[PDB]
Design a protein around this nucleic acid. Sequence first.
RNA 1: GCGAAACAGUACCGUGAGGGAAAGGUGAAAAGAACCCAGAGAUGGGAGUGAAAUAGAUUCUGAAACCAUAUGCCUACAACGUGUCAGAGCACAUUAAUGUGUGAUGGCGUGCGUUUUGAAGUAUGAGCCGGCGAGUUAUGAUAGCAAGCGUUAGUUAACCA
RNA 2: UUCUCGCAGUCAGACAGUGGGGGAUAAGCUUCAUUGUCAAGAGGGGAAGAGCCCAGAUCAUUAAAUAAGGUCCCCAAAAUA
RNA 3: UUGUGGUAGACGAGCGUUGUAUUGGAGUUGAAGUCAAAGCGUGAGCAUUGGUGGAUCCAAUACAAGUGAGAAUGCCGGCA
Lengths: 56, 144, 99, 158, 49, 139, 114
Amino acid sequence: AVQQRRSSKHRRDKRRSHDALTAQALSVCQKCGKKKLFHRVCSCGMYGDLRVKKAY
Amino acid sequence: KTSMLTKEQANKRRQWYIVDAAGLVLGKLAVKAADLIRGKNKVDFTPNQDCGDYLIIINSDQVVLTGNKKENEFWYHHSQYIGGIKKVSGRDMLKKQSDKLVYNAVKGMLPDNRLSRRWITKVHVFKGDKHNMEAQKPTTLNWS
Amino acid sequence: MHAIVVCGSKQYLVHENDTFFVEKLEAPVGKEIQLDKVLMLDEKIGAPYLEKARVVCVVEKHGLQRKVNVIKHISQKHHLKKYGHRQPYTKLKVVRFVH
Amino acid sequence: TKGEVRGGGKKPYKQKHTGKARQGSTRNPHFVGGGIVFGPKPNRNYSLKLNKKAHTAALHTVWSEKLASDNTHLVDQNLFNKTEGKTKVMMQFLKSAKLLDKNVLFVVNTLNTNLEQSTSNIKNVQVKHLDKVSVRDLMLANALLVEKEVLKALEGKF
Amino acid sequence: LNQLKSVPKARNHKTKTLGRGHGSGLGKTSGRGQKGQKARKSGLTRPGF
Amino acid sequence: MIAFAKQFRVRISPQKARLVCQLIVGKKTADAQNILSNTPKKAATLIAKLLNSAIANATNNHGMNGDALYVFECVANQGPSMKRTIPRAKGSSNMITKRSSNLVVKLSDNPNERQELIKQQKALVKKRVEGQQKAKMAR
Amino acid sequence: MRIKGGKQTRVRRKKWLKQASGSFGTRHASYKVAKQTVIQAAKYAYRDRRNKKRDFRSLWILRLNAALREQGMTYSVFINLLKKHNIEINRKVLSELAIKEPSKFNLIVQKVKS
RNA sequence: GCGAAACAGUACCGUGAGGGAAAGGUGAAAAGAACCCAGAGAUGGGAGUGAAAUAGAUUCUGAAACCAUAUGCCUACAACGUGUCAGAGCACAUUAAUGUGUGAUGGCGUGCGUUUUGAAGUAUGAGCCGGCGAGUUAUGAUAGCAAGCGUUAGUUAACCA
RNA sequence: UUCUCGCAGUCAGACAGUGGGGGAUAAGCUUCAUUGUCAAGAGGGGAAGAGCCCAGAUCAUUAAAUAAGGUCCCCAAAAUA
RNA sequence: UUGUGGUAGACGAGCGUUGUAUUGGAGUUGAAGUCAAAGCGUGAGCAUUGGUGGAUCCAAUACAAGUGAGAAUGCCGGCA
């Protein structure tokens, strides 16, 4: 159908509160200087001791 | 201009009270309970705070009723359903339930504000007197 | 303690030595006013009133009540009128008592 | 004005099946672009008729009223020609005559050569003739230098 | 009367409002009701007929 | 406070932008960088340059700790916006408002930059009443 | 000759939209809804100027009768007892205020006894 | 104010007749942001200048609606024009105030104007905000008021100073 | 309240007590005659209810006692036999 | 003393703003604007102070309004 009225700003904010994106994970990567997401690529682009891919 | 009307702000008094409804007429008991809850007998209550006190009942299922009134005002309770009615009768609550019976008999007899929601949690009805609640120092009386 | 005062049109059962605001009688600010009329004083209630007993009032300031903007608006008509009521208030307290 | 129509005298909108205003003309008094129905009409007369004798009485009244002022000292042709065409003398006169902060008017029937050339270099005084001056410079000046020569001519106005 | 204290002599009179506010009283009502020809544009047709 | 980052009229949905930079609000640089590095979107690669600029200003031209401060507030506001139309059915066109926004992020070393605002309002109140009383002693 | 009154009108409009306060969402930032809610609040206050009077009078009498019943007597009988003999000026609000006063309402009750 | 403070009847639409857009404000003086930094660039920041940099080019002033951010307050049992009066709680002192910020909750609570036989209306129309928008005026007359001037009044037309 | 003068505006009324007709002495139907309410005017009772009852209200003021109407209780509030 | 219920309808009392003319000054030693505020009037209102602000402004006195803005699915400087 079609609308009847406009929704307030706070109603919209509440609506978009749960319209957010999902969360992620944290994991210390052995072959890198920083952490990463569990079973993903790190800031150094390696899951761990095994390198997975190139950079350029 | 102002007579400085008194109402104890931030004060929600609660005193232990208990009754043994065995000579009270069911409606007389209900009107006395409504009087106690709203405060037609309270003299220093405050409406914007919690107006209820500690309220306890003894023998909530065997209140005496004079004349042909045990089965003369039957209790319906419908809802947003369609035909979803299970009308319950006076003979039923004698053995089915008494807490909901007295709660309805006082709520339809009182304001239906949100205060009753936290008033009912302060009401402790019992079909006997062996309950541990009597250890809470309640004053035994009647005609509340 | 207690004392009964009928100020202007209204009646007030108040305590001893309390400052209260009533409709303005233009009672003098700082100079004392006697009223032989009194009830419920000195823990004693006389039959009509108390005799040889007084309420002894004094005003510390005759201020003006805030802007009482009373507006009459009629639904689905063209009657929208406003008026500013500014009531002076007797801010007065009772000091001494005889019985 | 709405009489001026840029283009056809047609409707920008309609009444049925048109969710816009009722405007059946390109310009309307409410439309900001133009089309005022009640505007600044130039037909206004800007003139009110007053009686000749009424106006002469009014002139007499204002002359008498501002004769009573302080800086209205009696004047004549003699001191119109006594002063020179050079503005020096009349500023040295007015500054010492205290006609600066005032709006002093010279009541004149000579069109004096000294007055006409000067009095544009003075931010304080002005020159006007009998039949060339009204209640404006008579009264708003609050002190007008009346002339001894204009006496009898002014009397005849009644 | 110099134009710093001049006052009129009943030359201007009371000013009512027909297009000034909804609260003055007899404002948007146009002063001739709000129905019929007497209260609309190009109103008041020949009254002798 | 200082070294705040501003970008003008960047084309991005307000929803995705507000989400991806509110994932950074209240956090430091590295702890938020390593959590934004896994975002499957096309907004971090654009946003991170302003933060990099601000932090490099802090390192070279301001010389603060850098890690002491954190992203106090990101706002993607209703600035200039885009509208692109495409011909479609019935002879009409469908217009989509390709949202754009003036992005700005403010970095703070403390919960201030919002506390100091209420403090400024109250100081304004106090100097206002000082002036009003100076008028009220000059009666 | 244009008469450009814009500052006064702009200030009036800005204060009109800013007048609405304490309200949620898109309710305190639009002139028409703000004016409608102001009309509602004005009607609320005008009705209250007597509704609160009546409610507080009923409350006076309610706590008055509460103290009377805890004293063992009722307001009809109370006014009977004052009117018949020992009349006092202890009005409804005064009677209610006397209860919170320590045992002072009971003094009135025992005095108004014939 | 001319549609046009103008690179305006221009761009542009329409085959053609025919139409048809509006504009702004640097600083005394470019000193239009030295120096440096982040990305490949944008832009931003320090950075000084400049009286002053929301004057740093959104460059005299720099709003509102709208969009989001949040100091203190409330916050996960509650039927809605979210308000008014009373007022907690929590935190505090001012256009110096029967004090302030919210308002736990009670008392009281069918939007604005037209149709109106009655409209809260579930008739109506307004998304919103900031400006504007509708008994005005000339002539002549009725009334009302004020005024003039003489009892053959008042008064001037064209033309004239 | 007589009269002069300026301006009107209205002839969509609705309901109720009283005479009622028409219709089916049914109609939130018509209709006049008198009065009352809304209209053209609040409020109190009627749970809310335009018209029923009281009632005609500058406003404010936490003063009071009565009308309609309520006092077993929501819902101010009583008993007697 | 009437009052004060009011639609229609008439009548009473007046007010902000632009400019005309009178009349005063303030003026970077700080004006408008703009914002904010625990002021003052039967009412249109009088404003005050403080912040940006860096050149004009504010009181009438009467005048004349392109003078007052919520409605007409109005129009326009911007956005839900």
